[PDB]
Write a protein that binds this ligand. Structure first.
Ligand code: SF4
Ligand code: SF4
Ligand code: SF4
Length: 428
């Protein structure tokens, strides 16, 4: 009788964290509760009760016990390892492990969209990626995102997908649904942990062809299929040139076919990689989200909708009252994810804090040769972005400084004086 498989538990520099692998609700644990539950996980609730006996009498474990995180299924040196680990995290002052691992088994894509900066990139077997997958699993990764490139075009994709299902890792795969094999679709429809995400900009045939170079027919078909087989599905769109009418048009489609979740990502140009010109900014993206959410609730639709992108909080001057006190975890969870909450691995094995680091000319460590935990500790790229601090007047007066530090790190280092330059994305 230990901790539920549906729950993620990790030791952190401030004790520990609990996260639902479904509801995604979270609770910050202290050192006592963290060590208690760490034993509850490795030696059952009984042996855990033996230790901390005085604590239970002092109500120090009252809250921990009241949690519904338990299921059915040398403790001294196990407790020592816990203490050594927590101390090391305090030393490096980093989070335990990324919560999101993004993998790019292949960079090749059958399409070449204009809002894409990974188009035309032109691979290792799933056996290797399986090894990398185990490290993430055993180190406490919350979810794995499979991208590219068209991952359904990755030859060993079926094996990779199976490995994810077997390792019991919450996983998503993003596809254009153009040339996906029948074997691949079957694995997804019967999968319990893997969730497909469909790249679809609009139902309008003409516009989508301009944006993706294809009609939306095959994405629409695959979306309708999963609703039949009862498999959860998601739609992903980049806010480029769509009008509000074409957006709501796609909202209804998700409502009709019971799409699990619909996301609209902000669009960021990349000089020399993206052909399409940016029409809307983060302010416009906010108005859109406020528009869609009303339409969905005004129709009483159970559609999980959201907007996505970095520095989206810059479009809400209402907040940032300079009174925002962030918890030790929130201070590293919100904002730039490249710092503490995510990792990205390229097709050649190169490890990156973010995909944006691709265009950065600095040596990277290889995942097919070094351990993900070792890199997570001593990597120059992570240390660079983790330790960076802005000296901008407006930023230093800003409430969100800790999670932003004057905008996206990758953009700032390109400037003459990164420490003083504020990203144009923010106009506050
Ligand atoms: S389908 Fe996805 S990866 Fe392929 S070109 Fe378009 S955006 Fe880029
Ligand atoms: S480095 Fe830039 S693009 Fe990457 S997550 Fe952080 S803020 Fe966003
Ligand atoms: S760039 Fe500076 S002012 Fe703008 S949101 Fe980030 S820290 Fe606050």
């Amino acid at each position: 009788r230990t901790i539920s498989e549906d729950i993620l538990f990790r030791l952190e520099k401030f004790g520990g964290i609990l996260i639902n692998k479904t509801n995604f609700e979270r609770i910050e644990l202290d050192e006592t509760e963290a060590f208690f539950l760490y034993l509850v996980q490795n030696h059952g609730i009984e042996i855990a009760t033996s230790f901390f006996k005085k604590e239970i009498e002092m109500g120090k474990l009252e809250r921990a016990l009241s949690l519904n995180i338990y299921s059915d299924n040398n403790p001294y040196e196990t407790l020592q390892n816990a203490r050594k680990h927590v101390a090391k995290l305090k030393k490096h002052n980093i989070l335990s492990f990324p919560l999101e691992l993004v993998i790019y088994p292949s960079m090749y894509c059958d399409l070449k969209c204009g809002f894409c900066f990974l188009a035309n990139r032109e691979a290792k077997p799933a056996k290797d990626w399986e090894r990398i997958l185990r490290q993430a699993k055993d180190n406490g990764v919350l979810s794995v995102s499979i991208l590219g490139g068209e991952p359904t075009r990755y030859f060993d994709i079926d094996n990779l997908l199976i490995a994810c299902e077997e390792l019991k890792i919450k996983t998503t795969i993003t596809t254009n649904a153009q040339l996906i094999k029948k074997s691949t679709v079957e694995i997804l429809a019967k999968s319990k942990y893997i969730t497909p995400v469909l790249s679809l900009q609009t139902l309008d045939s003409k516009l989508n062809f301009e944006l993706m170079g294809v009609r939306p027919d095959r994405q629409i078909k695959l979306a309708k299929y999963f609703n039949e087989v009862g498999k959860k599905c998601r739609i992903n769109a980049v806010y480029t040139k769509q009008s509000y009418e074409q957006i709501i048009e796609l909202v209804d489609f998700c409502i009709e076919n019971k799409i699990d979740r619909f996301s609209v990502a902000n669009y960021s140009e990349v000089t020399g990689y993206t052909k399409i010109k940016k029409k809307y900014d983060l302010a416009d993206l906010r108005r859109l989200n406020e528009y869609v959410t009303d339409y969905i609730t005004q129709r009483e639709a159970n559609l999980n909708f959201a907007t996505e992108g970095c520095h989206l909080f810059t479009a809400y001057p209402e907040l940032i009252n300079n009174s925002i006190e962030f918890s030790e975890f929130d201070e590293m969870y919100y904002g730039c994810r490249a710092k503490y909450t995510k990792m990205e691995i390229m097709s050649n094995g190169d490890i990156l804090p973010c995909i944006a680091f691709l265009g950065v000319n600095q040596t990277k460590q290889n995942a097919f040769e070094k351990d993900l935990l070792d890199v997570w500790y001593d990597d120059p790229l992570y240390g660079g972005i983790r330790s960076f601090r802005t000296k901008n007047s407006k930023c230093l007066s800003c409430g969100l400084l800790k999670i932003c530090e004057g905008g996206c790190y990758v953009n700032l280092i390109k400037e003459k004086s990164p420490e003083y330059f504020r990203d144009s994305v923010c106009q506050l």
